[PDB]
Amino acid sequence: YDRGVNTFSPEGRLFQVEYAIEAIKLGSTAIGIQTSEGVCLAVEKRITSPLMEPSSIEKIVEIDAHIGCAMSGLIADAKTLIDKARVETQNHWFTYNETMTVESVTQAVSNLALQFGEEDSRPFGVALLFGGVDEKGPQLFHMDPSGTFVQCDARAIGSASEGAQSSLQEVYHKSMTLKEAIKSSLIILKQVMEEKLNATNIELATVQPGQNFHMFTKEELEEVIKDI
Amino acid sequence: TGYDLSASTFSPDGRVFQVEYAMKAVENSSTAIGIRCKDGVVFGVEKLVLSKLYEEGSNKRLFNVDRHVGMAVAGLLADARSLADIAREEASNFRSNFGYNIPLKHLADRVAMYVHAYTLYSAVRPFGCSFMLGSYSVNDGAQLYMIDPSGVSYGYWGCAIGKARQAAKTEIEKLQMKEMTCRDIVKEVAKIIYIVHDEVKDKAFELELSWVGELTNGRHEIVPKDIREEAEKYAKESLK
Amino acid sequence: RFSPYVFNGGTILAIAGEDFAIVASDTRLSEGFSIHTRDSPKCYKLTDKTVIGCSGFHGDCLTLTKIIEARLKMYKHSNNKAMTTGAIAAMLSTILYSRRFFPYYVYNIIGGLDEEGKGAVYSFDPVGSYQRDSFKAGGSASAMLQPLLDNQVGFKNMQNVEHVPLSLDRAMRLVKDVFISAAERDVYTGDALRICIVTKEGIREETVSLRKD
Amino acid sequence: DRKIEFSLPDLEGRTHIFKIHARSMSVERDIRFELLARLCPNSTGAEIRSVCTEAGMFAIRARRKIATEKDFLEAVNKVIKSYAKFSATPRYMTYN
Amino acid sequence: NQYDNDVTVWSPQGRIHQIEYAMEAVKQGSATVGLKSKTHAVLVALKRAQSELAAHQKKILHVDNHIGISIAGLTADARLLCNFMRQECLDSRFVFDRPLPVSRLVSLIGSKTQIPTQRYGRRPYGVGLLIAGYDDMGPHIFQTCPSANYFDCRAMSIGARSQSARTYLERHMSEFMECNLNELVKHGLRALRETLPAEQDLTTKNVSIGIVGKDLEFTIYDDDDVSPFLEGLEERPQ
Amino acid sequence: QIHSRKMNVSPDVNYEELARCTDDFNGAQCKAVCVEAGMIALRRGATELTHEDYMEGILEVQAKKKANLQYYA
Amino acid sequence: PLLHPERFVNLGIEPPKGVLLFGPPGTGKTLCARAVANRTDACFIRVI
Amino acid sequence: SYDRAITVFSPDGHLFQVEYAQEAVKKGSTAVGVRGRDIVVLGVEKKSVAKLQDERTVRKICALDDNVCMAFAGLTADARIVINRARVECQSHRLTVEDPVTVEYITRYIASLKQRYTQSNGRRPFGISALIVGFDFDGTPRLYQTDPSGTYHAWKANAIGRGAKSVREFLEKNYTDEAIETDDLTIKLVIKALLEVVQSGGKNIELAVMRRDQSLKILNPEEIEKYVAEIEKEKEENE
Numbered sequence A: 001y002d003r004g005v006n007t008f009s010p011e012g013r014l015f016q017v018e019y020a021i022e023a024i025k026l027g028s029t030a031i032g033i034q035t036s037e038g039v040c041l042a043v044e045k046r047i048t049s050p051l052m053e054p055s056s057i058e059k060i061v062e063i064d065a066h067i068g069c070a071m072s073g074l075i076a077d078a079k080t081l082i083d084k085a086r087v088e089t090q091n092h093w094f095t096y097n098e099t100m101t102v103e104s105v106t107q108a109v110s111n112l113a114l115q116f117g118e119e120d121s122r123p124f125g126v127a128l129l130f131g132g133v134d135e136k137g138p139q140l141f142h143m144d145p146s147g148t149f150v151q152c153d154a155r156a157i158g159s160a161s162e163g164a165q166s167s168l169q170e171v172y173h174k175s176m177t178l179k180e181a182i183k184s185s186l187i188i189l190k191q192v193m194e195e196k197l198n199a200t201n202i203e204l205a206t207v208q209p210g211q212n213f214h215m216f217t218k219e220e221l222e223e224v225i226k227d228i
Numbered sequence B: 001t002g003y004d005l006s007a008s009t010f011s012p013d014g015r016v017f018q019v020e021y022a023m024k025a026v027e028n029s030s031t032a033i034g035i036r037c038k039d040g041v042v043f044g045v046e047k048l049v050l051s052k053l054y055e056e057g058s059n060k061r062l063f064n065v066d067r068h069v070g071m072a073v074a075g076l077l078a079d080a081r082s083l084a085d086i087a088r089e090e091a092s093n094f095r096s097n098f099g100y101n102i103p104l105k106h107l108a109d110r111v112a113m114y115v116h117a118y119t120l121y122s123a124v125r126p127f128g129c130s131f132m133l134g135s136y137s138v139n140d141g142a143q144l145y146m147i148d149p150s151g152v153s154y155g156y157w158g159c160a161i162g163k164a165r166q167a168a169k170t171e172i173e174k175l176q177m178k179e180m181t182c183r184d185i186v187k188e189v190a191k192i193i194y195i196v197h198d199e200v201k202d203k204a205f206e207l208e209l210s211w212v213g214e215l216t217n218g219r220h221e222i223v224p225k226d227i228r229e230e231a232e233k234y235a236k237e238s239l240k
Numbered sequence C: 001r002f003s004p005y006v007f008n009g010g011t012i013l014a015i016a017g018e019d020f021a022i023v024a025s026d027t028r029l030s031e032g033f034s035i036h037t038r039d040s041p042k043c044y045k046l047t048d049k050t051v052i053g054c055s056g057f058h059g060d061c062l063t064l065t066k067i068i069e070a071r072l073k074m075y076k077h078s079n080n081k082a083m084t085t086g087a088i089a090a091m092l093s094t095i096l097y098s099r100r101f102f103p104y105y106v107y108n109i110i111g112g113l114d115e116e117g118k119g120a121v122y123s124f125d126p127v128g129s130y131q132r133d134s135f136k137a138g139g140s141a142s143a144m145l146q147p148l149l150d151n152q153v154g155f156k157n158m159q160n161v162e163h164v165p166l167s168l169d170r171a172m173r174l175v176k177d178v179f180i181s182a183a184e185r186d187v188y189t190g191d192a193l194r195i196c197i198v199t200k201e202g203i204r205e206e207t208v209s210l211r212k213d
Numbered sequence D: 001d002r003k004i005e006f007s008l009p010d011l012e013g014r015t016h017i018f019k020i021h022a023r024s025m026s027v028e029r030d031i032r033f034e035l036l037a038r039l040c041p042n043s044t045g046a047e048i049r050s051v052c053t054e055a056g057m058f059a060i061r062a063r064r065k066i067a068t069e070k071d072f073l074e075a076v077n078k079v080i081k082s083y084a085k086f087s088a089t090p091r092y093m094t095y096n
Numbered sequence E: 001n002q003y004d005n006d007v008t009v010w011s012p013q014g015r016i017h018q019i020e021y022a023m024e025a026v027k028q029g030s031a032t033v034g035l036k037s038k039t040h041a042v043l044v045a046l047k048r049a050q051s052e053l054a055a056h057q058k059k060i061l062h063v064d065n066h067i068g069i070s071i072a073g074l075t076a077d078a079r080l081l082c083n084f085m086r087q088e089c090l091d092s093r094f095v096f097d098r099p100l101p102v103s104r105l106v107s108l109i110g111s112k113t114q115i116p117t118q119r120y121g122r123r124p125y126g127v128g129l130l131i132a133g134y135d136d137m138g139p140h141i142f143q144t145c146p147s148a149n150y151f152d153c154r155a156m157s158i159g160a161r162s163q164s165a166r167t168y169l170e171r172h173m174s175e176f177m178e179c180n181l182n183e184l185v186k187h188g189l190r191a192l193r194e195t196l197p198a199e200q201d202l203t204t205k206n207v208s209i210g211i212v213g214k215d216l217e218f219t220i221y222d223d224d225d226v227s228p229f230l231e232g233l234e235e236r237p238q
Numbered sequence F: 001q002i003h004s005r006k007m008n009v010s011p012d013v014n015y016e017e018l019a020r021c022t023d024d025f026n027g028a029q030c031k032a033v034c035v036e037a038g039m040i041a042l043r044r045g046a047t048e049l050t051h052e053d054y055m056e057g058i059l060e061v062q063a064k065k066k067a068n069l070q071y072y073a
Numbered sequence G: 001p002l003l004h005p006e007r008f009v010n011l012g013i014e015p016p017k018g019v020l021l022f023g024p025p026g027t028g029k030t031l032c033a034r035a036v037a038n039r040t041d042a043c044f045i046r047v048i
Numbered sequence H: 001s002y003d004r005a006i007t008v009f010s011p012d013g014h015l016f017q018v019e020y021a022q023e024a025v026k027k028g029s030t031a032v033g034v035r036g037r038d039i040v041v042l043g044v045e046k047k048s049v050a051k052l053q054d055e056r057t058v059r060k061i062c063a064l065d066d067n068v069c070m071a072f073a074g075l076t077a078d079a080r081i082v083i084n085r086a087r088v089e090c091q092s093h094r095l096t097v098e099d100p101v102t103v104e105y106i107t108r109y110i111a112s113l114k115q116r117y118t119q120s121n122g123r124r125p126f127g128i129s130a131l132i133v134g135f136d137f138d139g140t141p142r143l144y145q146t147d148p149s150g151t152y153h154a155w156k157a158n159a160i161g162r163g164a165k166s167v168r169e170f171l172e173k174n175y176t177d178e179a180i181e182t183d184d185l186t187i188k189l190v191i192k193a194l195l196e197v198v199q200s201g202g203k204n205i206e207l208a209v210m211r212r213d214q215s216l217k218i219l220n221p222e223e224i225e226k227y228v229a230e231i232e233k234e235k236e237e238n239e
């Protein structure tokens, strides 16, 4: 009874979606931190080849001009979720002349991830981190293949997910600043990855209230790493 | 056994066990009896209280299909609710296409053919319900019908559906039901319920009595037994 | 043969204040040369900061009001907040265009407060184009009210007169004077005057009688 | 009467197991073990000890008397990745 | 074990096991308690944390101005029934211009959940809805189940270890009809504290209380306004 | 009820409520629930039993355990 | 029970007398049997 | 154990039927491709004519539009559907939007068409991998690649087919950060890369270049024989 999305267990819960949670584990790590000054975000690349072009590997995509994103797990299912998440923020501005809030973005995203066998296919294999600054300030959210949606203050997913969480709960507090949280995030990264941390293994993305631009760092990132 | 998975397959001796399995699921439900006098039909349902938090009149098994037609279901209660809405919808189209009340002989045929259709395909299962149909008219008198999960539907003078299907009809047939009035029937239905295992190995119960006939002028409603409480006063005197 | 449209009359007035908004309308419902009732206001409290007025064909006014009130609830449980004044005007423009080839015969004016606490008046057409204005007058007596408010509110064609902003008390007597002069020359206007005042403390109402002929 | 079953240690179990089977061997005094417990997802206590024995065997392939970090990283590929996966490692580009 | 695969397949004992397994998904969720007086119906739920610093998952959600529901079970079947619930509430406002009677809205749910418990191709809805409402004849407390049965009741507790909450409700149900909201709410949340392990306490960050009244619209209080309700309480007798 | 004669049972336990959740057991597994429930209360040093103490003793017979399964809110 | 045979009687319970160990191979079955032979202070019988 | 379905997961989170489609790519002839300063180049190996057939119907290199090329692997049947479909999209894009089609747009169409073709049961996925090379998007040379899972991706030098691991390891020690100007030098890099063929017969190489302004220029087995001669001229310095 463990090969069907249309079949329960004697105890409870799928396994099917439980197996879809396991597909996240073989991804890459990603850390996002919510701070009152804004939301920073970090990820690991895992570049395989030197001939492999680096900017064709995306981990941070721009959903909207005040909302970033992060992903892990299956790359093939991720590009489907990013597509409508750009469209649903665009349909909302067309009919309301306003920016869709960061919480209500994922409401539209979770409404299709819970449609895998509930029409009249398989569940997805990708967890997502959504950071953005809406009218309620900076926000940071999290979802899963099971459509379970929640708000987090600082979250780390992918591979090395549980090992990051124990060290990440140690140093977080409410009165952080943005420039402190950036250098606090990649102390965790060089302790959980196996290669030496340089300017080519990671990439950053921030968002601020008055600086809704710049969900990326372009070589400034070399200044942060050299002062670790 | 083995060839008993689908409802569209035959046994090597020639019967469908999926219909046979759903019949004895009705057997585990509590006893609901039905009886008709010369000028009416009187229903009666033994219904047990779940624990204590039941709120005295919830999830009843005495439905109301038409102005003069009601049900006395027993078995899976949720499956009977969907089946009752079919009979509500079937009697409405007969009104809109012919302009008068549905005859009970024609109503039971339309329902039993609908129950029959769920015993043929492998996509759906047979129902797990059995029920009663009672009505009264001035051009037709009183009738009382009976539908199994297989779809066999024909008329009785008295019946029982539940655990004590045999144990109730033993003492139904010792009544002179051909000439009694359905006010004297109501005090006689209540003792048939209380003889056979009301709260002996069970915890508690509550009696429901539905009611249709000449005194209601064709209407179907619950008894005013709340008034004067005479069913329990007359049946609890049969302790010895 | 059957014709699907008829004219019912009505007159709607809105004035955007500095920190307030005033919506006024008459309560006369007529058709042809008959009076259906003398008590039928055109004001509709959508939210605690937004009042809409609907003139024209009355059957479309009852329909379009209930569509907007349904979508207010559909916005809220999807977003955990209420709509703004400008969000309703953006939503209404898509609803009016959605029946482009069978149009609503309704003139619409939305008045209320923005997110800064100032007045805002949006005017409409039966197909769905809109703009933000300071004062508009829609309905059957629309031509009899726009030139006078250009003199008093907009200070047009005046010389040697300072531009003092309109206070609340001065704006009340300007509304009470234009409907007396409009009910004299127009036949689709009279029998009452419902006035709704939208401020930061809620919505007030006030009724002034007119001539009953 | 009692059905005690044994399962695989999640992460905190394995990080304790590496500190048992590698405390009595000449290693570099600055390495971390939590990175090693990542790379053994579905592994037993016997497989963890086989990694600890194999990493010292690479030190005798070279001429050393202490174990480095890359000694253990090659030992994980020797024990697990040489038998657990061969299609998912080169043709990996579905997951990053 | 071969009969334990589909919803269509009956058993030689006459019991479909797939409906019997969807009851087990209700016991995975946390406990929640609903009750009512003559005038006021209050349902109280219990939040559960995911991590040490994520937000707690919400349980009570607004539906209409006179209807609010609780939840226990799958979150996939939760919002799928909510979107069916909100659509039916505004259709009676758009057509009949009246609010729905609460007793006949739940009959639409039992017709909704009956089809995926008979036809192949869709599992039953693993869900534990508690319903409070106001028709013209006072408050109501309803529960549902994945076997598509709906039970009218005056007090009910479902979820994890909710049997200990039922024992508190049975020996205090005589007191519920007369008392008002200052103690009727804290009659209810004295029942949640037996569904807890005996070392931690019901704090302000893990509980939600929703009140709908005869003259009161359905209002959800959480994490800031629970403090006027948690005042004036005794501790557990330890 | 027979094998629980020799212990400190708090009198809010209905054995009919236990027969709701216990199914397809023989007589010896019913004895095994009664033995294991006495030791679960011994873990935290409890002095009497409860209905919750039996429910964990039921899952121990077929050797089950429960987590936060993150589907169930 | 071999070191405190009191709290079982002084509460009114009996200890179990048979324990099976099951699971994947190489998980630690023999270790738990090998370690209780160290700290037993009693008769212990391996059976081939 | 459990695969036999494209919708089921493994207990450790895998799609084996998707992973088995990549195993069918390794039965194909190798094809390499690099980008340069102005001239992009791609070559294929393993012609192996069989003495009795016409060789103009066994072509592995086709053009989708006027300034984009195509090289593939896998099995020949599934490539013909993807090629014929991509010619329609790179022509219908020009009708709806009057620009020429960029090299990035056509690779997202091939990947997304292979994406939804993996999700539904009873649809066997494409067992091909493709190389899209085009210096079309405003004078900029680019080359991408595909995958049977449906992941379009960009490299700077690529190898596929039966023996891609040796060639991709060869080019990492050979592709200089010094950009290969004097584009016959860049063509000689491919012939040196294709010199590590499965048999290296010399006359089994079909190199096709593009000077980013003209059309496709299929090389003849007399100009390519001249480039094979100068590769042996540089090999004389070993003694």
Ligand SMILES: Nc1ncnc2c1ncn2[C@@H]1O[C@H](COP(=O)(O)OP(=O)(O)OP(=O)(O)O)[C@@H](O)[C@H]1O
Pocket (backbone or CB within 6 Å): D017, D020, D044, D045, D046, D047, D049, G024, G025, G026, G027, G028, G029, G030, G031
């Ligand atoms: N939890 C653990 N902690 C430390 N070491 C362990 C653990 N589990 C296994 N080992 C190591 O693995 C080795 C083999 O384990 P062992 O043979 O006892 O497993 P087993 O389950 O008894 O095998 P089998 O099931 O085949 O009898 C032991 O020598 C021990 O050093």
Ligand SMILES: [Mg+2]
Pocket (backbone or CB within 6 Å): G029, G030, G031
């Ligand atoms: Mg052993």
